């Protein structure tokens, strides 16, 4: 917060984008800026020292500048794996290393309809007393998708949690789970249990539903 | 180099965090490099603990300075954080900054802060039906029930398939517990011979589960 980044910012593939660093007197334009590279899962990595100096392992692809008390981190020819959180960093005079709040970098590929697949509750769950179905949304882009849970052909709404992963390295897609939870009990009084899914990679929305016990 | 961070996943509140870093490959006697201590709170920025340098001189997060000892050994060195609340709970990195741009990180190891009770996961698999398949492509998966605390480590037949494996962020429940499912597509001409393991991992339970997904 010390050092000011967009959230976010995106390309499509082998386009380029610039990423800005805002400091002060007392950080950036007193010192130095370096960029870290985080992929999803992975501890950040150093990408750009000392303003612009590429360390080893890292294509010329990216480069980076500073004037005066602003930085900027360019990356010409955009892959999939470009996909990251980028923090730019600089020691401050009095208060140390400090760091930018971070930029999600997002890639503008081509929009895919999400594969639809459900999950009903296992046996070895419904012992326990409890009942989770698993609607999985898979691999679509861009990012907004909506979930619809039906019961016995009725909306459902409050019962169900969904997460979604971060932007995959290889294809630049994106993955929902939906997850509702019902008491055993609950499960049992009902016949069909349906996935109604949204998308602007669908003409009309997606149902993937089963009747208790079939397949 | 290699750095390799140390430490409990949990601990309680007001308690001191120990964590340390197993440094390989390299001594810690040789400027000029910074031996740093680095967190992250979850699904967020980054924050600098501190640095640590060979001839013992260190250099503080001013916000954390009144609450922070980093020291060197006669080849690791340590984080110590007193008095630790929820505001703590983040992943800590140890890293190695190189004044002349060689600089490694280690893995990171998360660190939650809390007085709740262990608890370890239930785990459940989404069998692969005809409602899981499409075009030749089979979905399966496991369900990682109700633990705590984060995180839990999800493998598919020992590490051996990483293509099409998704594993979500965890969710936290009313419970108040975390559930996580990890899904992969398969090939569906495999669903008959080839095995599929669910390796669950969670430490701070000790929970080593390996379901066969049918
Ligand atoms: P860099 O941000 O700062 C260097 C100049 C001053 C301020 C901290 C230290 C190093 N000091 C000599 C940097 C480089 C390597 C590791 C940490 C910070």
Redesign the pocket.
């Given at each position: 917060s010390v050092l000011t980044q967009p959230p976010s910012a995106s390309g499509t593939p082998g386009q380029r984008v610039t990423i800005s660093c805002s400091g002060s007197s007392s950080n950036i334009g007193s010192?130095?800026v370096?960029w870290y590279q985080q992929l999803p899962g992975t501890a950040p990595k150093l990408l750009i020292?000392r303003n612009n100096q590429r360390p080893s392992g890292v294509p010329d692809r990216f480069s980076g500048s500073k004037s005066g008390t602003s930085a900027s981190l360019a990356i010409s020819g955009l892959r999939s794996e470009d996909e990251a959180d980028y923090y730019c960093?600089?020691?401050d005079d009095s208060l140390?290393?400090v760091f930018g709040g971070g930029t999600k970098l997002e890639i503008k590929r081509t929009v895919a309809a999400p594969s639809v697949f459900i999950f009903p509750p296992s046996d070895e769950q419904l012992k326990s007393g409890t009942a989770s179905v698993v609607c999985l949304l898979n691999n679509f882009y861009p990012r907004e998708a909506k979930v619809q849970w039906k019961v016995d052909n009725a909306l459902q709404s409050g019962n169900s949690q969904e997460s979604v992963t971060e932007q995959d390295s290889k294809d630049s897609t994106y993955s929902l789970s939906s997850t509702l939870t019902l008491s055993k009990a609950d499960y049992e009084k009902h016949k069909v249990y349906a996935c109604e899914v949204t998308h602007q990679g669908l003409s009309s929305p997606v149902t993937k539903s089963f009747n208790r016990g079939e397949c | 180099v290699q750095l390799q961070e140390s430490g409990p996943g949990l601990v309680k509140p007001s308690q001191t965090l120990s964590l340390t870093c197993t440094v390989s490959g390299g001594s810690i006697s040789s400027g000029?490099?910074?031996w740093?201590w680095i967190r992250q709170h979850p699904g967020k920025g980054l924050e600098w603990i501190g640095?640590i340098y060979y001839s013992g001189s260190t250099?503080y997060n001013p916000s954390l300075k009144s609450r922070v000892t980093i020291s060197v050994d006669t080849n690791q060195f340590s984080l110590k954080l007193s008095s630790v609340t929820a505001a703590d709970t983040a992943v800590y990195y140890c890293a190695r900054?190189?004044?002349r741009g060689n600089?490694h990180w280690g893995q990171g190891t998360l660190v939650t802060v809390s007085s709740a009770s262990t608890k370890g996961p239930s785990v459940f698999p989404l069998a692969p039906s005809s409602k899981s398949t499409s075009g030749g492509t089979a979905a399966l998966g496991c369900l990682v029930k109700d633990y705590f605390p984060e995180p839990v480590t999800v493998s598919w037949n020992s590490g051996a398939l990483t293509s099409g494996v998704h594993t979500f962020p965890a969710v936290l429940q009313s419970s108040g517990l975390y559930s996580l499912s990890s899904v992969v597509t398969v090939p569906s001409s495999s669903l008959g011979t080839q095995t599929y393991i669910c390796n669950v991992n969670h430490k701070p339970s000790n929970t080593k589960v390996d379901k066969k997904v049918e």
């Open positions: 010192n130095y370096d020292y960093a600089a020691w140390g290393t | 000029g490099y910074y740093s640095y250099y900054f190189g004044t600089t």
